[PDB]
Amino acid sequence: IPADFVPDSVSGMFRSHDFSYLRLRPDHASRPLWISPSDGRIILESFSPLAEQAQDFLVTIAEPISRPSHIHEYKITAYSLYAAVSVGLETDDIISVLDRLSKVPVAESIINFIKGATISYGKVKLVIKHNRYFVETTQADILQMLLNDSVIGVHSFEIANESVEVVKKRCQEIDYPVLEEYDFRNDHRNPDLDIDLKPSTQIRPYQEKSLSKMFGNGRARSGIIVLPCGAGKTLVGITAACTIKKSVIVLCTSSVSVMQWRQQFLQWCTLQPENCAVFTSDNKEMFQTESGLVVSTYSMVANTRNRSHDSQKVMDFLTGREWGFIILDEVHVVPAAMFRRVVSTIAAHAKLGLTATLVREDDKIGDLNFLIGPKLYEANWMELSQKGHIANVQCAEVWCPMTAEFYQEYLRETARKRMLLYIMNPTKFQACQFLIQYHERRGDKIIVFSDNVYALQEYALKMGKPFIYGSTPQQERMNILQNFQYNDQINTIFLSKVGDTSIDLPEATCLIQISSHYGSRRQEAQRLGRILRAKRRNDEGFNAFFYSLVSKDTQEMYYSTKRQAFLVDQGYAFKVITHLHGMENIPNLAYASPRERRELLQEVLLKN
Amino acid sequence: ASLVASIVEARKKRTAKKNITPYQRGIIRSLILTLDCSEAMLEKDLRPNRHAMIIQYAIDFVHEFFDQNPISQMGIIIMRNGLAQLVSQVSGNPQDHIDALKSIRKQEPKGNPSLQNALEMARGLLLPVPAHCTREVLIVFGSLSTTDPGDIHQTIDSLVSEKIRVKVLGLSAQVAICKELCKATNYGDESFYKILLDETHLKELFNEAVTPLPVNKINKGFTLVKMGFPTRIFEDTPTFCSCHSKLVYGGYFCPNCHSKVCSLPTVCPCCDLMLILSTHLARSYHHLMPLKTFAEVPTTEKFRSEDCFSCQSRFPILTSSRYRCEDCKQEFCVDCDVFIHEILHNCPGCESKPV
Amino acid sequence: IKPVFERFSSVIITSGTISPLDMYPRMLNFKTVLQKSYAMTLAKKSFLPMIITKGSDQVAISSRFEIRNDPSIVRNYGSMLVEFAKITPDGMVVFFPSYLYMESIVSMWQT
Ligand SMILES: [Mg+2]
Ligand SMILES: [Zn+2]
Ligand SMILES: [Zn+2]
Ligand SMILES: [Zn+2]
Ligand SMILES: [Zn+2]
Predict the structure, then answer these.
(1) Which residues, 6+ apart, have CB-to-CB distance to C21 below 8 Å?
(2) Which of A257, A289, A255 has the alpha carbon at shortest distance from A273?
(3) Which uninterrupted H or E stretch holds A96?
(4) Which residues lie closer than 8 Å to A185 by C-beta, 6 or more apart?
């Protein structure tokens, strides 16, 4: 507080929130920045100068809380300041630029926070010499304090691979973080891989920014890069591999993703299909070349329950290979306990994380700081939406009025079956039937998401068009997928948690949700990203269409609000629709007669 | 530093309007706007699409043309699917063509253009037109090509022989055949094949096309024309009209054959003679009596007055915004300069100054 | 050129697209009295050259006979051929390096 700040009569609910004690600079017209020192928040104008230069700086040193079109709510965090000094930045420069572009005097607590969040950059480093995690620090000053720490037990010494994660968490805790910047040009102990950036690949500007933020020194800075759906994370990884030119391993959490990224990699880089050996229960071949790649999903390394000897040979081979680069695509699942064996198993130097969503239910997402590193780059979602790099969606949330026909049983149903009982409302069937009619009238490919296989198959059978879920085999689901894509008999399909994420299905510009998870925001966000990567995200007059059929009179409204609040905070609003269009103009309605409603009620009473 | 750019832009603008001339300009006009409604104007490339904005701008063009020059008839023929379709005969009532254009609103633009067919039937529609009427056609075009049944050059020669001019407002860029049309029809002038740069420029171009055009000395048709002022009645009884054959409370009465009509400025249906009011003929007198431009006096020199002569406001003070009417030796503000030069058509300083 | 040069002295060698000037006396044993060019004293820009190093999908293109039957390069070539055809008002010309290269690529765009 640069004032006396005598408490105002209107500042009672302003529990240290009345931010008028600051002496506002007369350059408030030009400068775009406020500071909120009560919570560390930052208030940023979208209509004053210096904001274009300050946007990347605020992303680097701060995190945004909320970014609508008019005012961006940012927040300096120690995580973001560590990311800033890891990119290469410092407290004094941050304070100087902040006072240069700030309308307001710089707060003492913020000054102290940025002073504290300055790391020993360059002091603590680790290298791998013949699959051995050598902790090579620049001084014995590091060795004294680290041996002063009880966990541990120029100059380089060994720390065990499972102990590497624990000691990385510990050194982050004592705020002595390690930078992992591989000198792949200087290191020739690893086999260099003759892969070249083909002229057929040219890079987007924000992707070039993402590379150069972690290629500022020419070394590969290890961390996270968060890019939206369809941004070209495969292209970014291909460019990083081609400019590293070493043995590289990338694991993604689907065998379909294994197939698709293997063909993407052999397409847009000069690595050879001989050098790429694909590992799965389809085939477990190995490449015998000095340099190349072996791809598998996380399952064929995590599992030890039912493993083949050829799988054992392959995992032995990858254990033997000292890789120079690792990318954990869809990094939201690898910090799970059966999945966080990556450092314990794979000897790889540079650790990059590419994913769409950097959020989850628990705090395992912050473990990537001592698993792979901080966020090296992020692309602004609404900026790419207006840039056409991702889509523009007219989301329409459908508040289906609850039928008492199903509510009478739903209220007296037990808890494990209440969910399946209120998913299956005949009014919801009626609304879905007219919505499918109306969007096939508009000529839009529609994908329907249900959390339950029986509800998915019942909706699919009432449509007369097939279903795909997690228990459907791969051959049947791809047959149904190609039937949907090319065959005009299959105009719409019925997808599930194999369709929510980790697939490339951007044709469906229309999406209707009949069910979802209880509170998993990431499933809903990935379902939105399924159509955010749509092909017609660039044409004029485009707005994608998202629909969520949710039953009234439940907790499902609060559930959907919880699942949607991340997208609302992103900028993907959820508009209110209760009275739909064309409710009786459709002649035939699914389970329209009350006898039909009681029929479906006792049909689902057979299970519930 | 924006005022220097505004000043040099005003200088480069005023270099074109330095020469103001009292050319003989056509009053008995004959304007045709043909419309293409093809696949090209289905592009949403300009918001919302080219078809919608040309519809709206044509509405405005009809209004402006009938307001400024009510002494002409207006015909519109649409182009669609390799056929040119007449939708609006030449008429004195703009409302007919307004309704026709409203029909054109809801229908769908599609097909390919044929300037040969379009201009040929435009010629045929322009055939039974009296000598004093100035036959001229506005053409809008969005294609870069034209499918045609036969030659265009015979049509060009015939149009030149029949003393009809054209002006092309192309959409995308220049088309060489349209340049050839404009040049050969327009005595070698290149001031008729115009391409917009945005929708505001299109608006300005339409406003430019509203104005009457000068005529040539060699194209001499100086004659008289018979005219008749009618008389309006306000009768108690409804009476049958001659034109639409229905009961009318009021209506003008024919000065010659004493019939009655329903609208003006129109020709008689019975004695077949044109009927107007003196307001209608005086409407173009600003074109007949143009206004000289007003000069800003320089900021360095001594000033006759420091506040505006006409609107009575203080002149603002780097440069001097005192637009002087040399015909009345009074300086004025920019707002009054704009209003007198565009909306008004007289200089009140010259009204006060006795001659 | 030896009969020419040794039979006539007042011989003028000039063109519009000769560059570099010295390479022709390099390749042919002759010398000239002065070697200079002329710059374009242009009031405003009238010619706009572009170097297309990449297709619509940021994919590079080349005319190499080995990679000649590449369908993606075909797709790019036909792509901007179509685009320039759509935006070209009056007249446009295409210059391939070889006739066989044409015959192949035109027959399969015909496909
Ligand atoms: Mg699924
Ligand atoms: Zn009448
Ligand atoms: Zn009469
Ligand atoms: Zn004035
Ligand atoms: Zn005057």
Answers:
(1) C35, C36, C37
(2) A289
(3) helix A91-101
(4) A218
Beta-carbon contacts of residue A197 (< 8 Å; ≥ 6 apart): A239, A242, A243, A269
C34 touches chain B (CB under 8 A): no
Query: What are the strands of the beta sheet with B73-80, ordered from one edge?
Result: B83-91, B73-80, B29-36, B134-141, B165-170, B193-195
Residue B9: count of CB within 10 angstroms of its CB? 10
Reading the block at residue B298, the tokens are 């320089």
Q: List the single residue in A with minimal CA-CA distance to B43.
A: A540
d(CA A433, CA A592): 11
| Cα A96 from Cα A295, distance rounded (Å) | 47
How many angstroms separate the CA atoms of A254 and B247, rounded?
83
Backbone angles phi, psi at B51, to 5 degrees: -60, -45
**What would the two tokens of residue B267 be?**
């020709």
Question: Smallest Cα–Cα separation from A508: which of A393, A379, A352?
Answer: A393
Residue A364, φ and ψ in degrees, nearest 5 = -70, -15
Nearest residue in B to C87, CA atom: B144
Chain C residues close to B144, C-beta within 8 Å: 87-90
Question: CA–CA separation, B348 vs A262, rounded Å?
Answer: 83
A587 touches chain B (CB under 8 A): no
What pairs with residue A495 in β-bridges? Answer: A449
Joined together, the tokens standing for residue A439 give 């969007």
Whether residue A200 and residue C53 make contact (CB cut-off 8 A), yes or no, is no
Give the type of residue at A431.
Answer: A
Q: Would you state the structure tokens that stand for residue A272, as one six-digit string?
A: 């050879």
Tokens of B154: 């015979």
Q: Please answer whether residues A233 and A225 qualify as being in contact, where contact means their C-beta atoms are separated by less than 8 angstroms.
A: yes
Q: Which residues of B277-311 are buried (b: 16+ CB within 10 A; e: fewer)?
A: eeeeeebbeebeeebeebebbeeeeeeeeeebbbe
Whole-number Å distance between alpha carbons of B171 and B173: 6
Q: Is A227 annotated as a binding residue?
A: yes
Give me the half-sphere count of Cα atoms (radius 13 Å) on the Cβ side of residue A246. 23
Identity (one letter) of the amino acid at B46? L
Tokens, residue C107: 């027959």
Q: Which of A327, A200, A343, A192 is nearest to A258 (CA)?
A: A327
Distance between CA atoms of residues A509 and C26, nearest Å: 65
Phi/psi of residue A328, nearest 5 degrees: -105, 90
A234 carries a ligand binding annotation: yes
User: What is the token pair recorded at B155?
Assistant: 């049509």
Cβ A572 vs Cβ A528: under 8 Å: yes
Where are the alpha helices (H) located in A201-308, listed in sequence order?
A: 205-213, 233-244, 255-268, 299-302
Asked if the Cβ–Cβ distance from C54 to A202 is below 8 Å, we say: yes
Residue B7 CA to residue A139 CA, distance in Å, equals: 67
Rounded-to-integer distance, Cα A271 and Cα A269, Å: 6
Q: Is B44 on the interface with A (CB under 8 A)?
A: yes
Cis peptide before B109 (omega within 30 of 0): no
The verdict on whether omega for the bond into residue C20 sits within 30 degrees of 0, i.e. cis, is yes
Cα separation, B32 vs B49, in Å, equals 23
- What backbone torsions phi and psi does residue A234 show, to the nearest 5 degrees? -65, -40
Bridging pattern class, strands B274-275 and B295-296: unpaired
Which residue of chain B is at minimal alpha-carbon distance from A540?
B44
Is A445 annotated as belonging to a binding site?
A: no
**CA A359 to chain centroid:** 7
- Greatest alpha-carbon span in chain A: 83
Find the discontinuities in chain A where C to next N exceeds 2.5 angstroms and give the residue preceding each. Answer: 153
Given a contact cutoff of 8 angstroms between Cβ atoms, the answer to whether B23 and B215 are in contact is: yes
**Could you tell me the two tokens for A513?**
């949700």
Q: Which residues of C touch A201 (CB under 8 A)?
A: 58-59
The CB-side HSE value for A244 (13 A sphere, CA atoms) comes to 36
Q: What is the rounded distance in angstroms from the CA atom of residue A77 to the CA atom of residue A379?
A: 18
Contact A359, A522 (CB under 8 A): yes
